[PDB]
Amino acid sequence: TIQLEKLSHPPARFDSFVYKWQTKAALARKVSGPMREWAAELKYRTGVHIELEPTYPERLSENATQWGAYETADDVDITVYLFGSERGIFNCHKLMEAAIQQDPVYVRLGIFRRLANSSEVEWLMLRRINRELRPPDIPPISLKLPGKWTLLYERYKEAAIRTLWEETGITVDASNVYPTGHLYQTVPQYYWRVPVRYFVAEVPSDIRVEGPQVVPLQYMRNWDARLLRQSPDPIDRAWAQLADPATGCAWMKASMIDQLQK
């Protein structure tokens, strides 16, 4: 249950009808998302614009009650504002109640191939170029397994399979896709962070990879291999060596990644 409070006007910091939801990050992150994955979907569905802020931001600068550090990100007090029509807000409210009962997450579908000469498998990876307006925990370029996030009402595996296709053009069958758990590592200051659900699936080693089918320009592609292999960054050089500039994808071993980080 979400209790909304109607406001007469927005506060000055937010320069339509306005409602407020006073809650915790444990719930607020489900209607927002680090990159507004869910906020944008809510806007798409209802026209309602969502804004979030920590209610007591000074507490986020504390290391050590009722006025010191928060124990966990989940405990962070969050004030959510909704701007829209009465009808949009009515509809958006309904969607949020459903969302906080779902568990919207990031998904990663680890596509892997087996090499004859090796017991360690190779993982398909991409490098996503991130926007200039991004939370501080996200680097300029994310090296990642394929996969994005669950849409509202979407099941985990369904989302993994759909977003694998969006990033790589690869179609896998659900019966070959295996969930393998989740990771969720965060701190109170990064209260927006969400769990990541993992899956694995084997593909044949000679499978044809097309690359991103959706927003392809948000991924590294068509770099200058000669130039990039002169980068001071070990990942850049491994990327120039192993990635296909036409697809923005590389087959990589975790052990090789570990050796680069030393």
Explain this structure.
The protein is α+β, with helices and mostly antiparallel strands. The chain has one domain (1-262). The chain is built from seven helices and ten strands. It has helices at 25-28, 37-46, 86-99, 156-168, 225-228, 234-242, 254-260; strands at 5-7, 17-24, 49-54, 77-84, 106-113, 122-129, 141-144, 178-183, 196-202, 249-252. Strands 5, 6, 7, 8, 9 and 10 form a six-stranded mixed β-sheet that branches. The longest helix is centred in the middle third of the chain and has 14 residues, at 86-99. The N and C termini lie far apart (49 Å). This is Mitochondrial edited mRNA stability factor 1. GDP binds at residues 108, 185, 194, 198. It comes from Trypanosoma brucei.
Question: Major beta sheet, specifics?
Answer: 6 strands, mixed
Order of helices and strands: EEHHEEHEEEHEEHHEH
Helix content: 10-25%
Globally, the shape reads globular
What structural class results from the helix and strand content? alpha+beta
Overall tally of structural domains: 1
Number of strands: 10
Instruction: Give the termini distance in whole angstroms.
Output: 49 Å
Strand portion: 15-25%
The Cα radius of gyration reads 21 Å
Helices, by number, come to 7
